[PDB]
Amino acid sequence: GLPGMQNLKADPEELFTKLEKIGKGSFGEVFKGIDNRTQKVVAIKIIDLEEAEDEIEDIQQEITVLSQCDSPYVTKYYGSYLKDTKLWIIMEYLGGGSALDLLEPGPLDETQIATILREILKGLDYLHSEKKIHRDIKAANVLLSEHGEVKLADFGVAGQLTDTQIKRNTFVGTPFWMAPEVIKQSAYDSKADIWSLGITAIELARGEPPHSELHPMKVLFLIPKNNPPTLEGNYSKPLKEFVEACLNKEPSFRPTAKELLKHKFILRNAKKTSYLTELIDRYKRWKAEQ
Numbered sequence: 047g048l049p050g051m052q053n054l055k056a057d058p059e060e061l062f063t064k065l066e067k068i069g070k071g072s073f074g075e076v077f078k079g080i081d082n083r084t085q086k087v088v089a090i091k092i093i094d095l096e097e098a099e100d101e102i103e104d105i106q107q108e109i110t111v112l113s114q115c116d117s118p119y120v121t122k123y124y125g126s127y128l129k130d131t132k133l134w135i136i137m138e139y140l141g142g143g144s145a146l147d148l149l150e151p152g153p154l155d156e157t158q159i160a161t162i163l164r165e166i167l168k169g170l171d172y173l174h175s176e177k178k179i180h181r182d183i184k185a186a187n188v189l190l191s192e193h194g195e196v197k198l199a200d201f202g203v204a205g206q207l208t209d210t211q212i213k214r215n216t217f218v219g220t221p222f223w224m225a226p227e228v229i230k231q232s233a234y235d236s237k238a239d240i241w242s243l244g245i246t247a248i249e250l251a252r253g254e255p256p257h258s259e260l261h262p263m264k265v266l267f268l269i270p271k272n273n274p275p276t277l278e279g280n281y282s283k284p285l286k287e288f289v290e291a292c293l294n295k296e297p298s299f300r301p302t303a304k305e306l307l308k309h310k311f312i313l314r315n316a317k318k319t320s321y322l323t324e325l326i327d328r329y330k331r332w333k334a335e336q
């Protein structure tokens with residue numbers, strides 16, 4: 047069965063006050079909501095199961111993976127409720143928004159980049175130690191709380207490694223952030239997330255990943271064919287080296303998340319997450335215009 051699936055007499059329309067749409071996730075739309083018993087804000091992903099076919103296997107896999115994570119770096123899963131044909135997935139609400147949204151008022155400085163990457167690395171180190179592969183690491187899937195806490199979201203394509211299945215070969219992810227071995231469907235592991243982290247580092251520095259102006263079909267030949275992307279522009283030598291470390295075509299040449307937590311870029315520039323409230327406040331003020 048479905049982990050965290052609640053009783054069918056539990057009416058989620060009664061238990062939760064469904065508010066405004068806040069975005070989209072894998073399989074459905076995400077709404078801001080209120081838990082009517084505690085009055086805490088939650089994120090609610092609603093999936094129309096009637097509108098799905100050969101996607102339910104993937105929906106169940108997402109819920110299974112989320113239910114298995116217990117980390118301050120991964121969005122918490124509170125349970126699932128079925129209302130007629132709609133599945134309500136209750137998740138932790140992160141009021142600072144995605145790192146992608148936070149880039150809107152303008153560029154990040156290197157302290158902000160290093161802080162966000164360090165927290166992503168904490169999440170990846172947790173997942174990889176649990177033999178899990180996120181497979182969709184990008185700034186849109188990096189969420190911040192109102193206090194500046196950074197967490198990984200969207201386990202829609204997450205993979206599980208076992209003692210009998212040491213590697214995966216499925217073609218999954220978002221083209222621009224995909225590792226060459228994933229695109230080529232070669233046997234891959236946690237190192238694919240290290241490549242996606244390198245692309246996310248470029249995205250946090252420049253605002254977009256490499257080849258962002260090209261059609262995603264073109265990048266399916268460009269990524270395996272071309273030398274890896276590099277970070278171009280007036281950025282620190284440690285930041286450019288952090289990017290190059292992640293973005294090696296040879297997966298065994300990429301460091302682990304644990305090793306990257308000790309990279310000179312991180313150690314010299316990262317600061318407390320509480321400082322990221324300045325970034326959230328900037329986005330709030332910028333939105334208070336538009």
Ligand SMILES: Cn1cc(-c2c[nH]c3ncnc(N4CCOCC4)c23)cn1
Binds near residue numbers: 068071137139143
């Ligand atoms: C990709 N993804 C993020 C969540 C999610 C969980 N908690 C949230 N709190 C606040 N905002 C969110 N997002 C905002 C962006 O769109 C999507 C929902 C979320 C789910 N999937």
